[PDB]
Amino acid sequence: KTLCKSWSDMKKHLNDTVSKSFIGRFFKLEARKTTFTTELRAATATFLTMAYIITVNANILADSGATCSINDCSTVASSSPPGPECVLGSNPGYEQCISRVKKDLVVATSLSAMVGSLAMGLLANLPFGLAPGMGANAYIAYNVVGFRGSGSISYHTAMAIVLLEGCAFLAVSALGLRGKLARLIPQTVRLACAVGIGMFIAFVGLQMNQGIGLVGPDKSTLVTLTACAETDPVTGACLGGKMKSPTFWLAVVGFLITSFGLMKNVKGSMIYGIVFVTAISWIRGTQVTIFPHTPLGDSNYNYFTKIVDFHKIQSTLGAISFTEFRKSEVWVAFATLFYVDLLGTTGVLYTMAEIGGFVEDGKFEGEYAAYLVDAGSSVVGSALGVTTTATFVESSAGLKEGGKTGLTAVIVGLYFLASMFFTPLVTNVPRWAVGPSLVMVGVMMMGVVKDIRWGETKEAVTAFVTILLMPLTYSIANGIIAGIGIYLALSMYDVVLGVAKWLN
Amino acid sequence: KTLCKSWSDMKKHLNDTVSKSFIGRFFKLEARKTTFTTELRAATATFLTMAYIITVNANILADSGATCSINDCSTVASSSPPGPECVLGSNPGYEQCISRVKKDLVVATSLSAMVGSLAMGLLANLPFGLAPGMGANAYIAYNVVGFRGSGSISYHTAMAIVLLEGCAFLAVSALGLRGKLARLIPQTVRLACAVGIGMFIAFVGLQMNQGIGLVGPDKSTLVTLTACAETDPVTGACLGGKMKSPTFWLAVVGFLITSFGLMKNVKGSMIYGIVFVTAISWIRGTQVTIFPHTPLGDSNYNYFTKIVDFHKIQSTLGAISFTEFRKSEVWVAFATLFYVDLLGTTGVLYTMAEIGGFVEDGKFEGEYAAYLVDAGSSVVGSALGVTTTATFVESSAGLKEGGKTGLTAVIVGLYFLASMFFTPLVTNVPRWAVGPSLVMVGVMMMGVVKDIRWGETKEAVTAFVTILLMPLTYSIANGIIAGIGIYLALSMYDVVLGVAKWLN
Ligand SMILES: Nc1ncnc2[nH]cnc12
């Protein structure tokens, strides 16, 4: 009929008047042959594969106990609450503190993914998006700061490391010291570190108080399968009954329809696995509720019955303190976070330049203004309370549908503006819904393990120690250090002595 | 000179009179073109790459607490010793029991690797050797029976599972039900199960009471890096001082010269890593001694000062009890050990037949008499107290030097006879010397991970859950079950319903 004919000739005309206006001259839409309409399809598919890190990042930096401390705890029958009693849960005053910080990290992630993505398109003309990157969320929140105020480094110092690393990554890039520096790292340590982070981030998404709750303590094997139904109220311990938890099996169904959606190539599928096992866990009354009948849960439901809200940052705003940079374990956390960002935004940003055909004999057309926008956005992301940004590989779903200019990245920046207003629906995602989303990240990073040269022995001993010691010793710093230490001693003690025997 | 000329013409004549005697007619040395001398070189290189499993198997089945029970414990100030006080160490009576069982497992491994290897050559004419296979040592000793009498299944029942699995693997092979049965298992579950066993067997060789002592307990992260110097006398706990254990750093030096020996292609190198960090840990006086000044250690040194001994099996001889086969977790341990032997001796025994050129369009010349010798040897190995046998992949070092007949496997059977008489030197290998040998096994099994199809999603979700849940939940049965359960639900719920929609 002429109904679709009246629909098709308008899209032949709306794509002309955009290119005949001024906005086609800035983004250069005449060359880089494309139209206005197929840029909008390139940014819709980029956002849906990227919309999961708006909730994963909030539910993983609220476990850090961001600004809640011992002073704003509750009052009990004693004269004063002691040290470790408040920060392990079951409190009227501390749990209402941490419900006002997760509302300040959903807004602070959209405002960090706006500025990173909206400044990528306007300054570099490149079709990809930015957000706080996955992989360095778990290093700061679980290994530097730790689960609810553990560890040694406070959260105010951890947001000062991100500034001083962010300013160290502009002025190692503006001088030209990148190809001199990144090629110094060998291929096997660079490639096996991305596998061990994927196994650390999935062992996070299995524990009792972190994600679903499979693994647990044991007094002779040091880890065992619990999955227990009736557990301890105060702490997490198995009282009895294995594999019959209604919060465990509802999370497995979310893990299947995420994986049954990735095959058959549904673009956004990790967002539909989160929405399905959340929309069951909102009905009051069941055993899988996030809304119980406690006074600690009536305040979340009375905020849920309104579906939109304009919420402002008020707790985890600019909070920096350089008054702790004169001890030892601050700089070790500095040299680790400088290491994992140098290898994250180097192998990704050039690989996403050869898809779509930007590249010539080196030096694609947005080289110099993409290393700095990816670096300055960690500085503006550190004042707002979140971690470093990274150019996402999910942005490839927009490279395979015809996005080639910077109008892709501006529209991606405008869905994050249209998703900070839905704050009452995003703070209320349960921690067993975000569990399988931390496991499918580990599936997609282990897919690079078929490029490690397992033929030679020195390349396989170095790659095995780095992969193994990251999820076991519960440390990312103990896999980077114990990989370089094996790679030198197997190599320096015969080759370097042999070169120094012949160079003189 | 004529000195080597007088050496070379004798080896031209000694190789003739062996082939002109009757012993060249049985093994058929005229065809399969080879001589007597280069068979002896093929069996020397086969033994040295196989001599590590004479000490690893004894130091991993003595941690099981094989026949030592609560009745032959010591006597203390109380009227009777309680249950868990004896079996956790620090006892005059229980520790002298377990020093008489490790002397009955060094002899029982050589007598099991004799009969398996000496009957492979005489009946099948194939050049490889047998011993109790690595991979099923840790399943029985740490996961069925457990560390020193833990768990549910006693050791007398675990040696009855090996009989009833051994007799079930003759009469699934003699009827012809192997190609019908082994091809039913898909490729990804078959291939990823061999990677997760390699990561379970290396997490064993890092713990505080098992191997070296890196990982340890923690009350908030459930695993942490201890490596602590001054520990608890009774139990294992970190009192203070990280990374300064003299038993930790002496084990790292053994891990380097094992790995520095595998590259540059030294044939036996895992045996020289064990001998070097043992021969330092025999000098009385140091901090790394295996011979302290206790009465529990004077009895090991007074047995060490003699260097040869003829020792007889007296504790872990024929000990079978079928009086526990009417409960649940016995058969689950049966179907796991039947699973891992079906996939171990199928992908190995055909791969070691295409090297050396035995094969034609299927059906190499020792098909039917090698599935049964590998199966009947687990029956004769179960009466003597050790686990199932397997055709070793280290036997390939003899396939690449010209071994093609059964005289290779007979001479390998005669080095194990000449290494049961050195029992006082083999019981005295410390548990931190056997530690890195359990880690280089995990390096050599992870080298098959570059053949898993990480392209498709169903092949990568199934392979990731199987690899991850074996070292974490400390279970081999929880990786086989949780791999089939993901592989059906991703596949049966759409394909099988679609086939049943079209078949009718
Ligand atoms: N840190 C990161 N770098 C690149 N792509 C990512 N996708 C998710 N996290 C990422």
Ligand SMILES: Nc1ncnc2[nH]cnc12
């Ligand atoms: N179980 C096993 N099967 C084959 N080769 C092996 N090498 C060591 N253990 C083995």
